[PDB]
Amino acid sequence: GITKPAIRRLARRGGVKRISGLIYEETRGVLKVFLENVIRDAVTYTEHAKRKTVTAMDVVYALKRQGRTLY
Amino acid sequence: IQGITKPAIRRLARRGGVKRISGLIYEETRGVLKVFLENVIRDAVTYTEHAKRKTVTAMDVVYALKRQGRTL
Amino acid sequence: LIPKLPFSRLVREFIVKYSDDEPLRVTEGALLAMQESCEMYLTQRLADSYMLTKHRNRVTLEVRDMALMAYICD
Amino acid sequence: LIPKLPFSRLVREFIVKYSDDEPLRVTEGALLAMQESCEMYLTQRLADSYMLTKHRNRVTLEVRDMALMAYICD
Amino acid sequence: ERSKAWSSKMADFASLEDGMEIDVAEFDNLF
Amino acid sequence: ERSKAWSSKMADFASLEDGMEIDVAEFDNL
């Protein structure tokens, strides 16, 4: 899903000073959840609009159709 | 808020599965209630005002609750 | 349930506060619905703050957890 | 940023999964937007789980906090 | 889930209402 | 403060896109 160290780099961006070894797998799960929802919504909108291509605006529609993105 | 019953705060805590409570909790809970109810009433009144009616109804309460999102 | 005696005072306060020009009257069902909602909502939010309490391996709910809850859900 | 090499793996997996009978073409801008979104969202959610970590007076983020986070925001 | 329970309760609220009040002029009769 | 940052990022995503792909037929070239 994610590499190994990219998880660390995102943690260090987030202000996480120390990490447990299990975290990466859990983090991967998180990513799988998030993207999986987003793409779903985006695809569905692209499918409603009767277009063949996911666009940046379709990604925006999918993100906006989340609600819990902020906190 | 001023008179929101102290043991009623306790009873709601005990319904929620809270076993022990701090003394400061009651005023914080009162703040919470004021926030929630105040938002709800705001929205309900506003909808009743858009519909050009004089009376808040249970349906207007439903509209106000539904227009919350973080209720769940 | 909580008593109507102090509850209806707050409902009245806020009806007066956010009604435009005429106090906006009220129905009985509206009052009952508001009371039901606030009781179960306070039960709910207390339970979740107590989940935070449990998360820090202590059993006593305190304003630490209430404030974290406030920071989570505004 | 994370590399595209494993990311587009998953983007393809899920385009194919929910496509509705034609694989759905997915422009470059869409890919970049998805990558940006997932990176900052993971940073965000890690920071919040680490807020839980701090809340229990320990500095090491672990699946305890990740799982409480999962409960909070599904 | 919480959401199902709240949606049930709100579906319930679509019910009995009657008894318009003029809040203060009627709250005397809530004791 | 999070909401403002996300809304900025989404305003950014409102930008140019081009390069339609046929995901598998493309992703060899990633």
Residue numbers in the entry:
A (entry chain D): 29 to 99
B (entry chain B): 27 to 98
C (entry chain A), D (entry chain C): 47 to 120
E (entry chain F): 17 to 47
F (entry chain E): 17 to 46
Paper text:
Centromeres are microtubule attachment sites on chromosomes defined by the enrichment of histone variant CENP‐A‐containing nucleosomes. To preserve centromere identity, CENP‐A must be escorted to centromeres by a CENP‐A‐specific chaperone for deposition. Instead, fly‐specific CAL1 appears to combine the roles of both HJURP and the Mis18 complex: pre‐nucleosomal CENP‐A recognition and its targeting to the centromere for deposition, respectively (Phansalkar et al, 2012). In this study, we present the structural basis for the recognition of CENP‐A/H4 and CENP‐C by CAL1.
